[PDB]
Amino acid sequence: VKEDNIEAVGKKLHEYNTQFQEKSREYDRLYEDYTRTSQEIQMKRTAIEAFNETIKIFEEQCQTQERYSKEYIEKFKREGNETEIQRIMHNYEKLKSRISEIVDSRRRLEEDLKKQAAEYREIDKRMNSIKPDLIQLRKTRDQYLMWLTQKGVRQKKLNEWLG
Amino acid sequence: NQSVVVDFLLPTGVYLNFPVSRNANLSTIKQLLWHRAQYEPLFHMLSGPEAYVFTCINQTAEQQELEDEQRRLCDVQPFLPVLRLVAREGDRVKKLINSQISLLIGKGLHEFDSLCDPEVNDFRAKMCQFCEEAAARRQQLGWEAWLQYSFPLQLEPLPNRALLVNVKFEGSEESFTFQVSTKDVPLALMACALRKKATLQVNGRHEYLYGSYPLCQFQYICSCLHSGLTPHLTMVHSSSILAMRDLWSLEQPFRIELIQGSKVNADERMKLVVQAGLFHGNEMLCKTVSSSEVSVCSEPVWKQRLEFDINICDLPRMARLCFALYAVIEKADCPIAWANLMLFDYKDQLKTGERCLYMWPSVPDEKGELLNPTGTVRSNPNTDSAAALLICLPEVAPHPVYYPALEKILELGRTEEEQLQLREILEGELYEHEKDLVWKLRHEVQEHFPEALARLLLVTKWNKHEDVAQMLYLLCSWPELPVLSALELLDFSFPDCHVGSFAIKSLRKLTDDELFQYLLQLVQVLKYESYLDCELTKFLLDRALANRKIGHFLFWHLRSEMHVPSVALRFGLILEAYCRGSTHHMKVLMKQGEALSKLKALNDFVKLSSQKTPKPQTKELMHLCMRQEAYLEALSHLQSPLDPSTLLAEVCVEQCTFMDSKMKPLWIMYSNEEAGSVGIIFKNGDDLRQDMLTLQMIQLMDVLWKQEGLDLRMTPYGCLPTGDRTGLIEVVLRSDTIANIQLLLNWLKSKNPGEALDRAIEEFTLSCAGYCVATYVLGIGDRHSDNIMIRESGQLFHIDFGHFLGNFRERVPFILTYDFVHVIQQGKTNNSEKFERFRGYCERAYTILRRHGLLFLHLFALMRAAGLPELSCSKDIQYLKDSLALGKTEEEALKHFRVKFNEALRESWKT
Numbered sequence A: 001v002k003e004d005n006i007e008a009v010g011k012k013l014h015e016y017n018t019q020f021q022e023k024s025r026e027y028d029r030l031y032e033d034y035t036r037t038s039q040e041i042q043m044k045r046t047a048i049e050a051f052n053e054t055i056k057i058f059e060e061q062c063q064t065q066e067r068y069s070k071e072y073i074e075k076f077k078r079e080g081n082e083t084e085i086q087r088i089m090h091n092y093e094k095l096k097s098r099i100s101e102i103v104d105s106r107r108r109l110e111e112d113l114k115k116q117a118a119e120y121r122e123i124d125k126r127m128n129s130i131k132p133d134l135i136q137l138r139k140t141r142d143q144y145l146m147w148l149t150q151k152g153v154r155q156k157k158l159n160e161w162l163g
Numbered sequence B: 001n002q003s004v005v006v007d008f009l010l011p012t013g014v015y016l017n018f019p020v021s022r023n024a025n026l027s028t029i030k031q032l033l034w035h036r037a038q039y040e041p042l043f044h045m046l047s048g049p050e051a052y053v054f055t056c057i058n059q060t061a062e063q064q065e066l067e068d069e070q071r072r073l074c075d076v077q078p079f080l081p082v083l084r085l086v087a088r089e090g091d092r093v094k095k096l097i098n099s100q101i102s103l104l105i106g107k108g109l110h111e112f113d114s115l116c117d118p119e120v121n122d123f124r125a126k127m128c129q130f131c132e133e134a135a136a137r138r139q140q141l142g143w144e145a146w147l148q149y150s151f152p153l154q155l156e157p158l159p160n161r162a163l164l165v166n167v168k169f170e171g172s173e174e175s176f177t178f179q180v181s182t183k184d185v186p187l188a189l190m191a192c193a194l195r196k197k198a199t200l201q202v203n204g205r206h207e208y209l210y211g212s213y214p215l216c217q218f219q220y221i222c223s224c225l226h227s228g229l230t231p232h233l234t235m236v237h238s239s240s241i242l243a244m245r246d247l248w249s250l251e252q253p254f255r256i257e258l259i260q261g262s263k264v265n266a267d268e269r270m271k272l273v274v275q276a277g278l279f280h281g282n283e284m285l286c287k288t289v290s291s292s293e294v295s296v297c298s299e300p301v302w303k304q305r306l307e308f309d310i311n312i313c314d315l316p317r318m319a320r321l322c323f324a325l326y327a328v329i330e331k332a333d334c335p336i337a338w339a340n341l342m343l344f345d346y347k348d349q350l351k352t353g354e355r356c357l358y359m360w361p362s363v364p365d366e367k368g369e370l371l372n373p374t375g376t377v378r379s380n381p382n383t384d385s386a387a388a389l390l391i392c393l394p395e396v397a398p399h400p401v402y403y404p405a406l407e408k409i410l411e412l413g414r415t416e417e418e419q420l421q422l423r424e425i426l427e428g429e430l431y432e433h434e435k436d437l438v439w440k441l442r443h444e445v446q447e448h449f450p451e452a453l454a455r456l457l458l459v460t461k462w463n464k465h466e467d468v469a470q471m472l473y474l475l476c477s478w479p480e481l482p483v484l485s486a487l488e489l490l491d492f493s494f495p496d497c498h499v500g501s502f503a504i505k506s507l508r509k510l511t512d513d514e515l516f517q518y519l520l521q522l523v524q525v526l527k528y529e530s531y532l533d534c535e536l537t538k539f540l541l542d543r544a545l546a547n548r549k550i551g552h553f554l555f556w557h558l559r560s561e562m563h564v565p566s567v568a569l570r571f572g573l574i575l576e577a578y579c580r581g582s583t584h585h586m587k588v589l590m591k592q593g594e595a596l597s598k599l600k601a602l603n604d605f606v607k608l609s610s611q612k613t614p615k616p617q618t619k620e621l622m623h624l625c626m627r628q629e630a631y632l633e634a635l636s637h638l639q640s641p642l643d644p645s646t647l648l649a650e651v652c653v654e655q656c657t658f659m660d661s662k663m664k665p666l667w668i669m670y671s672n673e674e675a676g677s678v679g680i681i682f683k684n685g686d687d688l689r690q691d692m693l694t695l696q697m698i699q700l701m702d703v704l705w706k707q708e709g710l711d712l713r714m715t716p717y718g719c720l721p722t723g724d725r726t727g728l729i730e731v732v733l734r735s736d737t738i739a740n741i742q743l744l745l746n747w748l749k750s751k752n753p754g755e756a757l758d759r760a761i762e763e764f765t766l767s768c769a770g771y772c773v774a775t776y777v778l779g780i781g782d783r784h785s786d787n788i789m790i791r792e793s794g795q796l797f798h799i800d801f802g803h804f805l806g807n808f809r810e811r812v813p814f815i816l817t818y819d820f821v822h823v824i825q826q827g828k829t830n831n832s833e834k835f836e837r838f839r840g841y842c843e844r845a846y847t848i849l850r851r852h853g854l855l856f857l858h859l860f861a862l863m864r865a866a867g868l869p870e871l872s873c874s875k876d877i878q879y880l881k882d883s884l885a886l887g888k889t890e891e892e893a894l895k896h897f898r899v900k901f902n903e904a905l906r907e908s909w910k911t
């Protein structure tokens, strides 16, 4: 406690409490963001697992297409049906082209997750710089509250400074 | 858009891509696919449509076999619109259940496999089997047993009058109305109808009337008697029910290799310290050994050894190595993150080697203590971004060491002036001089004070293995404590596994009805658990599989917290296990979860559509969204999540609205042509846990009172959190707010004419007393005409509770409202006869509550696990000791209550 006069300490208790209520409101808004970003990040990470799962299935399909076409490309060639082979291969060209679309979409999410993982870490840095200030304002406010209680200040006056 | 382009993968390797409606069912899509596939190569080789099944990568990133082809693509919701035809056969039974669990529990089962933890995998193996066994064992049992399982009795906690009761039969629209005794058993009520037929189940409900109880002891009959209405029942036997049914040597000090830190985010002008202490519950096992200061960076390096004042052999079974990363300004301190670790693993083996602990963020609170021993002993699931500490436990012997088995533990464990000095002490903080006495006379505590076990367990020196053995020896021979005492032993302060097992041993005496009243506290206490497999989980699951209603509320207590990272793994594992053993209810919970998912989107629409157009415009714009086939089907015909014995049948889209409030909640109405007009409120935006705790507490009071023959005609409406700031609230029909009524005795006149007005006046007086006593005890302030509601019957009740035990922490006084006293007095200025009868109810209600005071303290103390800010410390619990004047005598309490009563009346006059 810096000063030693009842009304002067009382004004500082009000100022320090206002400064405390303010800084507490800032940290609560930043913990709202940290919680929100934590949820959005585990969403983007499961959506990345989903793209990987989708691509796996698209790759299993190419495996199937390659082993399964083998027996039929050889059979339609001997029958002069170079038309059926052309149809099978162009359908495969079609499949592979879609894989490249899905791959690119998976890549776009990896960019968002990298940008949002950097947003989260900056949020945590912005919170960890507010915590020493927030904790100090609490301790200060409490010491002024005690000082005036010890000095015999009435609850009505104490409530008037806090509220 | 109505349509979406879908990618199709045929088993021949052929790829087809065409548009389909988002509201189309899979069965229809398979037909559109076969129609297009014929014009693409290799069609001749495909088997018939019915020989194949669709596969998709769902929202949870898991492969899903789409067996129910009656589901619409929008309901299926695949991640990308990609479908693969796969072979239909291949033990589809497990494949369907495993998939439907992942959707229902809100987490993919593959997320459990991904972890690569034997603890997780052993839990799944033991728990799913035990649950599957109980489910099969359930199917074996008779028609009577299964009826007690699915539809357990809903009884009330007396005179013998005449009741006119209706009866009917399944399919038959012919009713045989006959009178029967109020105290008559349902065996007689059916026999009197069996004879009446030639010359069980409430219709429109999943409530049955059976067992050796009198007709009036049932909740439906009780409501029918007071509300006047005649009970309508449907006689059913076996046929329809079966259709429904189908080493101590290691004396070297404890060491820890604090090696590295990872992804740390702080101000570069500071240094970084890592404080570490050992804990068993809330007590320290030794001194808080700290690290050296290192410059602020993302990846700090210490490679420092931390030695604790405790030799390895003295470590208890439930020893916790707690960490906290602090940012200090070289030479107020900033707590960055914290992490706890068990020294012994689930298999009893003392952990050895490198352990990477993904740290949890520190939150600044009133008790800014360096360490957090109460926090989860699990890792942060956000392994992507979360800071971490690289530690390494060193090797101690060539072979791994396990904590001594019970046989080895119980082996090492085997005046008269002080006898009075113990009596005075065990009569709630015991100092060092008191702790040492209680411990010496520990054999006298087991002999003369079995109820004081909790005091004794705390005095025990858990940091010296000699002391620990002596205590556990007594525990293994301790007398069975009452349920009230057992409740206290569930608290974090008693972490020893043997204590939990003794506590559960005593909780096994609970009737399904009493267990229901503590279910919320019991679910919360799981957050205090260290291992996944524990006695409490087993108990909770065993009970949930024995009773469908308990199972239902266990599902929703766990589900509504699946977003909280600290419980998500634990709660997820329990739900999967509950689901494997309750496949029937699993279908009900799916119908509920679907309607809830639609209402969130319907609420999200109305929230935005209110910030544009007015109230009746948004109302009809809402109704159109509700009238959609995929919406209306999902919201229609489902069991009520608030009370699963209530059937929410036909949605009344005209009656459906939203409330002009802080979060704009949806008013959804239901009509039933077989039952009367049930309603529900879907609220999204603010946490409904506090309101559920308050209402649960008021329900307990209501039961405790009813037990002493005092019915204060209370309205305990349902409130159920279903998820992250999501929930439901039961619509109390034929009721409005005091404020809206005063735009009071005229409202009762226009709703109770003749001799009905004196009935309402008694309902008002009875409910007023109860809600006055309840709001005083719970410290519920800010009670005004906007949050107080009256029912057309005369019953008064409190709505929307936000502020708990003072916490607007200032004492809330007993409050009597002028308007209410006026109504109690029937309109008179002085009506001593009526007013003193009312004062008697208040004094009786308060006295009953004091008798069960410790139940409320124990229940609230366990609720500290919930993380509610208005219930976080011992002072919040202290509020109840003071409100219930527990540190006084019944006579001293009653005269202070009377003083506060008289002053509540005097202050009522001032306003």
Ligand SMILES: CC(=O)N1CCN(c2cccc(-c3cc(-c4ccnn4C4CCOCC4)c4c(N)ncnn34)c2)CC1
Binding pocket: B657, B659, B661, B665, B667, B681, B683, B717, B729, B730, B731, B732, B733, B735, B736, B737, B799, B800
């Ligand atoms: C018929 C109709 O649409 N009406 C008439 C009744 N109206 C009305 C007016 C005032 C209060 C109310 C109102 C508030 C609450 C209530 C109890 C606990 N929480 N809440 C709500 C939940 C959502 O968030 C706000 C508090 C309830 C309730 N259980 N039953 C009937 N009405 N009712 C209801 C709403 C408009």
